[PDB]
Ligand binder design. Sequence first.
Ligand SMILES: [Zn+2]
Length: 730
Amino acid sequence: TYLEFIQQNEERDGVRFSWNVWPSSRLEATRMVVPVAALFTPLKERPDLPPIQYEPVLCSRTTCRAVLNPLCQVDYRAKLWACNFCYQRNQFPPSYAGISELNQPAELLPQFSSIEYVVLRGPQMPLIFLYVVDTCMEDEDLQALKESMQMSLSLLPPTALVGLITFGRMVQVHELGCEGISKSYVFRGTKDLSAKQLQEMLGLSPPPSNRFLQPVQKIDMNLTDLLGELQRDPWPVPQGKRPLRSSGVALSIAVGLLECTFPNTGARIMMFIGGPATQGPGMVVGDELKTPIRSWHDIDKDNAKYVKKGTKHFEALANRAATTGHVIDIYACALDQTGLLEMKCCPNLTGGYMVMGDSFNTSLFKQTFQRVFTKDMHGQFKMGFGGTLEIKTSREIKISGAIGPCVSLNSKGPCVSENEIGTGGTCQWKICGLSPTTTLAIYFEVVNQHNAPIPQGGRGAIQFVTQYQHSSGQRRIRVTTIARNWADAQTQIQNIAASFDQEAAAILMARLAIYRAETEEGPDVLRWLDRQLIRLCQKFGEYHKDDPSSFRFSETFSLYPQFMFHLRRSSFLQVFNNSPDESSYYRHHFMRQDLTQSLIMIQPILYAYSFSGPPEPVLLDSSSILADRILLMDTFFQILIYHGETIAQWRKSGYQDMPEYENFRHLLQAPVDDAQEILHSRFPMPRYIDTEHGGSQARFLLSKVNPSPILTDDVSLQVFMDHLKKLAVS
Ligand SMILES: [Zn+2]
């Protein structure tokens, strides 16, 4: 089964390919409109497998150096292995001399196609956490933020190094390790500062001691008291004015601080803001409340003064922190926009988190901020730091590029395609921050000539190697080797077509579309998206020419156009009903999510709970809203519960509470158990809504159903389908 294949290979290798059978011909690979691409989760949580306590064995050929993997043929008589990539014959290290067919090392076993090594790379390093805190907010929000930060301090490893940079109109860099007296350097939040500047201005260069960054359990009590001591920015806010907030200067100081003290090691720069930057480089809006912040209309009509300048400021800091190996988080809670559009590149490129909300004094934020510090079954943070991702391919496949939370390392080589996609031109990327959630999209190109024979073994291989700093300080190397069969398209079209993963392809094409819209500022992303959908219909559909009623799709393709119908009208591509900060927020989380959550984002799921049936997903239509059943809707960003008319009065009357009807008792608790399960797992925490037929709060449900570029923009899926069928049969 291909369903069973897709599911097993993601659970084991954390990979979802657009096509699980690849065409031998580079010419026919183009003719299949969706490229050979994969969603890749490098740290896919794998509790069944143990960590391997020795060094990976590497192919001795200089131009290759691939890791020993289960696809390598082994001469158990001669104690040699042949690399599946370059066919070099390699000897095993003398530790393996007792290798045999029935007693082979872990890396050769098919259960370890995905494997993690624990290696020794010199001195261990403690985790670093730099809190950059906005103090231009109300005392309630500031006090609530103080609790969450004190709480996070209690969870950090005892050896972890912490530091505090507070800022309002001024930027104050605090000094730790000093007890009985505390110093602080104060900067104007009006001028920018470089690394070499800050080093000389702060005078920088077996228990270790740095002035600005100190161990947690060693200076634990002084800081948690200080966070409670922290009060508002003392400057008064005049009439109709916004506080002078200089977040861009504080971030530049925070980035430059770690840059010339602890470069090239794990560090989180966590910026908390309760409003937009109003002063200094990186400013998003003036201090006059008379002038509104932003809108997609203002920037479109070129009426946004501070957008282009401020964006360049944060882009410069993002590439400095990514080059240094540092993570930048942004926790923004305010009643209005905070500048996420101009700041998105800092978490987007370093793998840092982006969190939205109305205030810090909400359940939503407090629960989200502690999910950041979720520990695994061994008591260690689920965070990884300074990940280097190297990909190696068979000589018939080249790498077009990657799309997701990463930065290119500019590693050229034979596997790198000349035609680039996303973050391309390299076979290595840096990912400063990652978790078992982090999912990149890698795009490949079949290079084998059209009339060339099928490659040697009949299957193409791809190896993913991820070296990262574990949250325990250990150096880990995660290796995943996959293989898919080559196919002669001239004789095996149905084999290729049957291996199509429509869910993976839809998301893989979505990342292309969103990257092309958000980056490079494409004007007609939909016209590309519509054209590719029509070709896929013309290629893999069944029809008689000029007969739209004849058109049909097999089960392997039938869901793809519906995905495209919701994608092209979703908030990731149509932004003019959200604020620029909101649009950047949705795209930030989509670009780093697995397949399951990505499908939920593009096409929200609607489960119906009715008698005489288990919970069944139903069409996102007003027709699904029936009186007999209770429906759950997941939007990823939000969860909603809705009860029909007849069920609404049953519950208020209390038949649930009757000892007669245990029948109704479990029907109104089943979706709440299911909703609460998604609540306490997803990151960030989604906002939750429970409503009924009266539905004062049920407006978002109806706004997601029946809500009101060659293909039609009509809201009715059928009208979109009948137009797609018409064009596919031309
Ligand atoms: Zn090799």
